[PDB]
Design an enzyme around this catalytic site. Structure first.
Site, short mmCIF file in Angstrom:
data_model
loop_
_atom_site.label_atom_id
_atom_site.label_comp_id
_atom_site.label_asym_id
_atom_site.label_seq_id
_atom_site.Cartn_x
_atom_site.Cartn_y
_atom_site.Cartn_z
N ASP A 95 -2.47 -1.76 -2.98
CA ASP A 95 -1.55 -0.77 -2.56
C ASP A 95 -2.00 0.27 -1.51
O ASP A 95 -2.90 0.71 -1.51
CB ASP A 95 -1.20 0.27 -3.89
N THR A 96 -1.52 -0.24 -0.32
CA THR A 96 -2.10 0.31 0.79
C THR A 96 -1.55 1.92 1.05
O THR A 96 -1.99 2.57 1.94
CB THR A 96 -1.65 -0.41 1.99
N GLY A 97 -0.84 2.34 -0.07
CA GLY A 97 -0.21 3.78 -0.13
C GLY A 97 -1.12 4.54 -0.92
O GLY A 97 -0.68 5.83 -0.88
#
Lengths: 99, 99
Positions: free
Chosen positions: B25-27
């Site tokens: 999850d790059t967020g």
């Protein structure tokens, strides 16, 4: 480009004749951008907002430019703490995670 | 490996001698895993939860193996709808987004 993950991966977005920025978010299915006007017809869409469900707009077949790369995809227009590019548009970019 | 984004990017995770899966999850800044036991010291951490501030555990210098790659990083142990590998650990893997 190659985007490292040492900081939040924000990208320049050109959409609806406007320039903004958004977070590349592999944890998000959909793309959501606030305070931009998009042309033509939309479909109703429900997101979880602060408080309950918000009724917002989903636009299909929208031209978007991300760090200079042109794609066409679906964009939700609604309240969001941060603009987010989700997997729908990242897959149109041909974006991959690599390690 | 190379992971595409047409579907949710889940990876196998080996941690605390247990096998689970988690979403790349790059967020997300932090990595959070539910229902694992980790050895030794943690530092109390407060996160926003449903109803509360949630009091969870931050473990540092934890060996983690993701799709067979071995890193050391910080892991939050606490309730989460889905286990998440955040940017902290993805940066240790040397993961990049590419398009």
């Amino acid at each position: 480009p190659q985007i490292t993950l040492w900081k939040r991966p924000f990208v320049t977005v050109k959409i609806g004749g406007q320039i903004t920025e958004a977070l590349l978010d592999t944890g998000a299915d959909d793309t959501i951008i606030e305070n931009i006007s998009l042309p033509g017809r939309w479909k109703p869409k429900i997101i979880q907002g602060i408080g309950g469900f918000l009724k917002v707009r989903q636009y299909d077949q929208i031209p978007i430019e991300i760090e200079g790369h042109k794609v066409i995809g679906s964009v939700v227009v609604g309240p969001t703490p941060v603009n987010v590019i989700g997997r729908n548009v990242m897959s149109q970019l041909g974006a991959t995670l690599n390690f």
